[PDB]
Design an enzyme around this catalytic site. Structure first.
Site, PDB file in Angstrom:
ATOM      1  N   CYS A  19       2.929  -3.129   9.935  1.00  0.00           N
ATOM      2  CA  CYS A  19       1.946  -2.730   8.937  1.00  0.00           C
ATOM      3  C   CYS A  19       1.458  -1.330   9.302  1.00  0.00           C
ATOM      4  O   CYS A  19       0.357  -1.147   9.813  1.00  0.00           O
ATOM      5  CB  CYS A  19       0.843  -3.782   8.875  1.00  0.00           C
ATOM      6  SG  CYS A  19      -0.332  -3.529   7.480  1.00  0.00           S
ATOM      7  N   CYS A  44       3.361  -7.679   4.809  1.00  0.00           N
ATOM      8  CA  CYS A  44       2.955  -8.342   3.565  1.00  0.00           C
ATOM      9  C   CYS A  44       4.138  -9.090   2.945  1.00  0.00           C
ATOM     10  O   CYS A  44       4.069 -10.274   2.613  1.00  0.00           O
ATOM     11  CB  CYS A  44       2.407  -7.348   2.515  1.00  0.00           C
ATOM     12  SG  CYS A  44       1.000  -6.349   3.019  1.00  0.00           S
ATOM     13  N   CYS A  57      -6.172  -1.480  31.748  1.00  0.00           N
ATOM     14  CA  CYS A  57      -5.586  -2.275  30.695  1.00  0.00           C
ATOM     15  C   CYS A  57      -6.571  -2.407  29.536  1.00  0.00           C
ATOM     16  O   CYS A  57      -7.800  -2.377  29.738  1.00  0.00           O
ATOM     17  CB  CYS A  57      -5.198  -3.634  31.272  1.00  0.00           C
ATOM     18  SG  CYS A  57      -4.832  -4.948  30.086  1.00  0.00           S
ATOM     19  N   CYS A 112       0.614  -6.065  14.606  1.00  0.00           N
ATOM     20  CA  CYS A 112       0.867  -5.895  13.180  1.00  0.00           C
ATOM     21  C   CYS A 112       2.213  -6.440  12.704  1.00  0.00           C
ATOM     22  O   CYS A 112       2.381  -6.638  11.496  1.00  0.00           O
ATOM     23  CB  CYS A 112       0.724  -4.422  12.771  1.00  0.00           C
ATOM     24  SG  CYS A 112       2.054  -3.301  13.226  1.00  0.00           S
ATOM     25  N   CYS A 145       5.140   1.459   3.533  1.00  0.00           N
ATOM     26  CA  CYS A 145       6.563   1.315   3.948  1.00  0.00           C
ATOM     27  C   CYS A 145       7.361   2.487   3.474  1.00  0.00           C
ATOM     28  O   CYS A 145       8.308   2.891   4.129  1.00  0.00           O
ATOM     29  CB  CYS A 145       7.215   0.024   3.417  1.00  0.00           C
ATOM     30  SG  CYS A 145       6.780  -1.469   4.274  1.00  0.00           S
ATOM     31  N   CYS A 191       4.798  -3.186  29.145  1.00  0.00           N
ATOM     32  CA  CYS A 191       3.717  -2.219  28.992  1.00  0.00           C
ATOM     33  C   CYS A 191       3.452  -1.472  30.297  1.00  0.00           C
ATOM     34  O   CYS A 191       3.410  -2.059  31.359  1.00  0.00           O
ATOM     35  CB  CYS A 191       2.430  -2.930  28.539  1.00  0.00           C
ATOM     36  SG  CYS A 191       1.027  -1.803  28.328  1.00  0.00           S
ATOM     37  N   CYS A 206       0.789  -1.212   0.000  1.00  0.00           N
ATOM     38  CA  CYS A 206       0.000   0.000   0.000  1.00  0.00           C
ATOM     39  C   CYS A 206       0.835   1.282   0.000  1.00  0.00           C
ATOM     40  O   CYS A 206       0.289   2.366   0.133  1.00  0.00           O
ATOM     41  CB  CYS A 206      -1.048   0.014   1.134  1.00  0.00           C
ATOM     42  SG  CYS A 206      -0.443   0.485   2.806  1.00  0.00           S
ATOM     43  N   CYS A 210       7.590  -0.748  20.337  1.00  0.00           N
ATOM     44  CA  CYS A 210       6.686   0.402  20.285  1.00  0.00           C
ATOM     45  C   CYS A 210       6.442   1.060  21.622  1.00  0.00           C
ATOM     46  O   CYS A 210       6.231   2.271  21.691  1.00  0.00           O
ATOM     47  CB  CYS A 210       5.352  -0.052  19.704  1.00  0.00           C
ATOM     48  SG  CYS A 210       5.520  -0.790  18.065  1.00  0.00           S
ATOM     49  N   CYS A 216      -3.129  -2.447  20.671  1.00  0.00           N
ATOM     50  CA  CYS A 216      -2.228  -3.098  19.726  1.00  0.00           C
ATOM     51  C   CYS A 216      -2.976  -4.163  18.922  1.00  0.00           C
ATOM     52  O   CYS A 216      -3.746  -4.951  19.490  1.00  0.00           O
ATOM     53  CB  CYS A 216      -1.070  -3.733  20.493  1.00  0.00           C
ATOM     54  SG  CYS A 216       0.157  -4.674  19.510  1.00  0.00           S
ATOM     55  N   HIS A 235       3.743  -6.476  25.864  1.00  0.00           N
ATOM     56  CA  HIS A 235       2.981  -6.593  27.106  1.00  0.00           C
ATOM     57  C   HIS A 235       3.847  -6.621  28.353  1.00  0.00           C
ATOM     58  O   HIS A 235       3.550  -5.947  29.353  1.00  0.00           O
ATOM     59  CB  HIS A 235       2.137  -7.860  26.974  1.00  0.00           C
ATOM     60  CG  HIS A 235       1.408  -8.283  28.203  1.00  0.00           C
ATOM     61  ND1 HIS A 235       0.235  -7.695  28.629  1.00  0.00           N
ATOM     62  CD2 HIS A 235       1.662  -9.291  29.069  1.00  0.00           C
ATOM     63  CE1 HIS A 235      -0.200  -8.322  29.703  1.00  0.00           C
ATOM     64  NE2 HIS A 235       0.653  -9.288  29.998  1.00  0.00           N
ATOM     65  N   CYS A 295      -6.629  -5.653  22.940  1.00  0.00           N
ATOM     66  CA  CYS A 295      -5.177  -5.494  22.837  1.00  0.00           C
ATOM     67  C   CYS A 295      -4.458  -6.838  22.646  1.00  0.00           C
ATOM     68  O   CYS A 295      -4.643  -7.778  23.422  1.00  0.00           O
ATOM     69  CB  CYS A 295      -4.640  -4.802  24.075  1.00  0.00           C
ATOM     70  SG  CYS A 295      -2.884  -4.393  23.935  1.00  0.00           S
ATOM     71  N   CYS A 332       0.134   2.779  19.803  1.00  0.00           N
ATOM     72  CA  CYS A 332      -1.169   2.158  19.606  1.00  0.00           C
ATOM     73  C   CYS A 332      -1.823   1.795  20.921  1.00  0.00           C
ATOM     74  O   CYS A 332      -3.038   1.968  21.057  1.00  0.00           O
ATOM     75  CB  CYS A 332      -1.034   0.916  18.756  1.00  0.00           C
ATOM     76  SG  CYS A 332      -0.177   1.221  17.184  1.00  0.00           S
TER      77      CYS A 332
HETATM   78  S1  SF4 Z   1       0.064  -4.760  26.295  1.00  0.00           S
HETATM   79 FE1  SF4 Z   1      -2.202  -4.527  26.155  1.00  0.00          FE
HETATM   80  S2  SF4 Z   1      -2.739  -2.722  27.532  1.00  0.00           S
HETATM   81 FE2  SF4 Z   1      -0.607  -3.377  28.036  1.00  0.00          FE
HETATM   82  S3  SF4 Z   1      -0.885  -4.732  29.869  1.00  0.00           S
HETATM   83 FE3  SF4 Z   1      -2.923  -4.586  28.852  1.00  0.00          FE
HETATM   84  S4  SF4 Z   1      -2.999  -6.341  27.328  1.00  0.00           S
HETATM   85 FE4  SF4 Z   1      -0.824  -6.045  27.970  1.00  0.00          FE
HETATM   86  S1  SF4 Z   2       3.107  -3.893  17.049  1.00  0.00           S
HETATM   87 FE1  SF4 Z   2       1.041  -0.695  17.033  1.00  0.00          FE
HETATM   88  S2  SF4 Z   2      -0.110  -2.532  16.316  1.00  0.00           S
HETATM   89 FE2  SF4 Z   2       1.976  -2.708  15.449  1.00  0.00          FE
HETATM   90  S3  SF4 Z   2       2.807  -0.633  15.657  1.00  0.00           S
HETATM   91 FE3  SF4 Z   2       1.217  -3.198  18.097  1.00  0.00          FE
HETATM   92  S4  SF4 Z   2       1.862  -1.278  19.111  1.00  0.00           S
HETATM   93 FE4  SF4 Z   2       3.474  -1.697  17.574  1.00  0.00          FE
END
Ligand code: SF4
Ligand code: SF4
Ligand code: FCO
Ligand SMILES: [Cl-]
Ligand SMILES: [Fe+2]
Ligand code: NI
Lengths: 279, 481
Positions: free
Chosen positions: A155, A117, A228, A264, A17, A207, A14, A243, A261, A204, A234, A255
């Site tokens: 992606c 892709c 969460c 991707c 990239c 996170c 698309c 990320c 998330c 995660h 997610c 994201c």
């Molecule tokens: S990566 Fe997603 S918002 Fe973060 S703790 Fe909640 S499920 Fe894992």
């Molecule tokens: S890997 Fe966005 S959906 Fe892809 S950019 Fe999930 S947090 Fe990284």
């Protein structure tokens, strides 16, 4: 030193990239183009066109046989004798993506499969598709082409993953030469062909909402940024990307902060990560 | 005598396009456009949770993904009966509006400007045609190069603006059925405004003036590329919650007449397209996508949409012509100073000059200036901290259509839901309206027709063929999907 020649061929992509690469901060895209690589063929941004552009690529490919970097974006569709992706015409003969990869693939120093892709098939290979969309590594293997492949999925990917993988390769080649250098790059790829500096850590487990996950405190609406995001869909638990740290677009968001998330960068995107908005 | 010229790939557009033109006595006398790559989103989408569409459809096109996001969530909003909170409506406008700025700047500088400007002596700016017809003085060419370089930063900043409330770009996370996923905070609205000031200054001081100034060195380019002189706008950017008012109001213009837009009059033909013959002439509510890559006579994966039988164009020219806003102050000034033209509103350019190769670049620059005022208004209107989303249940059975204007022109998505899954999903996009092949009656697509009369005084350097194509800012990902 001399900037390596790069050809960028798009199959069923698309252009995400390319656009993501334009968003690189450090280095800027201007610096990438003028100081890091020599982008000899790229149909979205290059000056020339048509058969002249194709012939320019072929001339460079001959001069730098075994030495150029081939960026492949998009999947490679094999159905209908390659007709679902025609990328050019020269000598009154159409050139399909299948044709182009068979021509340039064997003579590249390395193939960089950019985006999910190209790396894994992605959306064009997902359920309901009918073009025989094929990942780059599979296509090359099926056709006896042994050129090293590095996957840089997403992606789209983050620009830092694309530029950073190029720099990984350049550093290795400076230290070890071309063959020895690419061997050192292959050593830092995970089992899905992804460089561990960018894809070696789980979203995660890193996170900032992990404490809420552990407590079972889940947001019931997207706009609740305290809980969460797992119940909202997610896929962080199943996703290997950085990320959470580098974030997106100059660090202004990512994201999980914004929504969820969708996984991707993973080989099963999209079908194995769907539905996106439930666990 | 005739000379036939094929150009594949056409470069400095998005996606895969072949153009083939017939040249006689120094002008194009026939043309065929071929979109050469197919993915089949309309079939990939079938069977999925409908909410997935607003992510999947963005991967049609990484240059205009916010447009597909917007059309998809509008269709889903209608199908689900989701009532988007007012603050979510405005937040969506900030997300999508920022990509209009990105896309127009990308298009003029990074796609189009090399048609008129010689870049530095290194790839990808060389090699190129020996006689590229690059007319600018040393000084003005250097300004072009300097602005191309500056524009790389400015378009990147526009994507930061998109990501502030959209999550990331390409491919926003922040628009869903029911609204926008992140309430704007005071702090992030300051960040958006600071970036927007930089973009505004670039648009006002560099981009709009450079388009008129380069145009004044290419005055011949206002006298070709008229095609059908027929345009479509389906409306975009809701300015209130009642839906009675949009930044761009809908309308059709053809054969010198303004008419209302009635979406029931859209049909897609496939005689010259690689799809099963039995699917020809369908309105999108009953659309079908059945590929036939071997079908004799066909030359494109782009379908041929017609409006009440008419072949129409879309994009900034279409919108600016239909809506006829006041011209920017700098546009008015440069029209007088550089062209000797006295104009107040867009239509004062006249039909011929507006519907022209260079007129399409001017329209896009003017529209960019116009969008500054819209975004400024939304920044005043938005309320920090106010909820932007509702969380509606997925219906078992429903249908919806979303209409908007992507940066390149009119876009609609239609979805039908059955057993809580996507039963049908149909997309009619901007570059589909512009870059399509002949219909079942043999009538050319908009760009095909606009190529007629384009000068080619040198068949070995036929630069004006792709110059005309690039004026329409094609993206073949959108066109074919
Ligand atoms: S990566 Fe997603 S918002 Fe973060 S703790 Fe909640 S499920 Fe894992
Ligand atoms: S890997 Fe966005 S959906 Fe892809 S950019 Fe999930 S947090 Fe990284
Ligand atoms: N802009 C944009 Fe994409 C196209 N053409 C859509 O719709
Ligand atoms: Cl967009
Ligand atoms: Fe369609
Ligand atoms: Ni597009």
């Amino acid at each position: 030193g001399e900037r390596p020649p790069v050809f960028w061929l798009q199959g069923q992509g698309c252009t995400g990239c390319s656009v993501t690469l334009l968003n690189s901060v450090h280095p800027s895209i201007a610096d990438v183009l003028l100081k890091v690589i020599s982008l000899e063929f790229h149909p979205t941004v290059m000056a020339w066109e048509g058969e002249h552009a194709i012939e320019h690529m072929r001339k460079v490919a001959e001069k730098f046989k075994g030495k150029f970097f081939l960026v492949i974006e998009g999947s490679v569709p094999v159905e209908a004798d390659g007709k679902y992706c025609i990328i050019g015409e020269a000598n009154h003969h159409e050139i399909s993506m299948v044709d182009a990869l068979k021509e340039f693939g064997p003579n590249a120093a390395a193939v960089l499969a950019v985006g999910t892709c190209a790396a894994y098939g992605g959306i064009p290979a997902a359920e309901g598709s009918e073009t025989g969309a094929t990942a780059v590594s599979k296509f090359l293997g099926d056709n006896g082409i042994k050129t090293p492949v590095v996957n840089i999925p997403g992606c789209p990917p983050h620009p830092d993953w694309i530029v950073g993988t190029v720099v990984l390769a350049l550093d290795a080649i400076k230290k070890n030469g071309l063959e020895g250098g690419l061997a050192e790059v292959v050593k830092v790829l995970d089992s899905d062909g992804r460089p561990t500096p960018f894809f070696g850590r789980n979203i995660h487990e890193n996170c900032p909402y992990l404490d809420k996950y552990d407590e079972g405190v889940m947001s019931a609406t997207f706009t609740d940024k305290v809980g969460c995001r797992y119940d909202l869909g997610c896929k962080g638990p199943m996703t290997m990307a950085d990320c959470f740290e580098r974030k997106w677009n100059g660090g202004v968001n990512w994201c999980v902060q914004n929504a969820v998330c969708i996984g991707c960068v993973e080989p099963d995107f999209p079908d194995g990560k769907s539905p996106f908005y439930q666990a | 005598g005739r000379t036939t010229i094929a150009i594949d790939p056409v470069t400095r557009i998005e996606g895969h396009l072949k153009a083939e033109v017939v040249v006689e006595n120094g002008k194009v006398v026939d043309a065929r456009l071929s979109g050469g790559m197919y993915r089949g989103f309309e079939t990939i989408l079938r069977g999925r949770d409908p909410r997935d569409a607003s992510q999947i459809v963005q991967r049609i096109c990484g240059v205009c993904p916010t447009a597909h996001s917007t059309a998809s969530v509008l269709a889903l909003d209608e199908a689900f009966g989701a009532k988007v909170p007012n603050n979510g409506r405005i937040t969506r406008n900030l997300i999508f509006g920022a990509n209009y700025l990105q896309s127009h700047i990308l298009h003029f500088y990074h796609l189009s400007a090399q048609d008129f400007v010689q870049g530095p002596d290194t790839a990808p700016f060389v090699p190129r045609f020996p006689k590229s017809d690059l007319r600018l003085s040393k000084e003005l060419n250097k300004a072009g190069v300097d602005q191309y370089i500056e524009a790389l930063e400015v378009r990147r900043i526009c994507h930061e603006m998109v990501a502030l409330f959209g999550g990331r770009m390409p491919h926003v996370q922040g628009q869903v059925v029911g609204g926008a996923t992140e309430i704007p905070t005071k702090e992030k609205l300051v960040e958006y405004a600071a970036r927007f000031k930089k973009v505004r200054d670039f648009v006002e001081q560099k981009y709009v003036p450079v388009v008129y100034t380069i145009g004044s060195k290419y005055k011949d380019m206002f006298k070709v590329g008229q095609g059908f002189k027929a345009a479509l706008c389906v409306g975009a950017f809701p300015l209130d919650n009642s839906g009675k008012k949009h930044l761009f109001m809908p309308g059709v213009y053809a054969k010198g007449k303004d008419m209302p837009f009635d979406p029931s009059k859209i049909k897609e033909y496939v005689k010259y397209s690689w799809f099963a013959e039995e699917t020809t002439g369908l309105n999108y509510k009953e659309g079908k996508t059945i590929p036939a890559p071997d079908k004799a006579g066909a030359y494109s994966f782009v379908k041929a949409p017609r409006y009440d039988g008419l072949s129409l164009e879309v994009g900034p020219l279409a919108r600016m012509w239909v809506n006829n806003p006041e011209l920017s102050p700098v546009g008015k000034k440069l029209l007088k100073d550089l062209f000797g033209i006295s104009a107040k509103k867009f239509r004062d350019l006249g039909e011929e000059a507006a519907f022209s190769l260079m007129g399409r670049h001017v329209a896009r620059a003017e529209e960019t200036y116009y969008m500054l005022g819209a975004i400024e208004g939304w920044l005043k209107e938005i309320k920090a901290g106010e909820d932007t989303v509702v969380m509606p249940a997925v219906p078992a059975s429903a249908e919806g259509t979303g209409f908007t204007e992507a940066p390149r022109g009119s876009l609609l998505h239609y979805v039908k839901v059955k057993d809580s899954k996507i039963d049908n999903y149909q997309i009619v996009s901007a570059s589909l309206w512009n870059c399509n092949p002949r219909d079942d009656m043999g009538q050319r697509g908009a760009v095909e027709e606009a190529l007629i009369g384009i000068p080619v005084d040198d068949i070995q350097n036929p630069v004006n063929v792709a110059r005309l194509i690039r004026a329409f800012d094609p993206x073949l990902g959108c066109a074919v999907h």
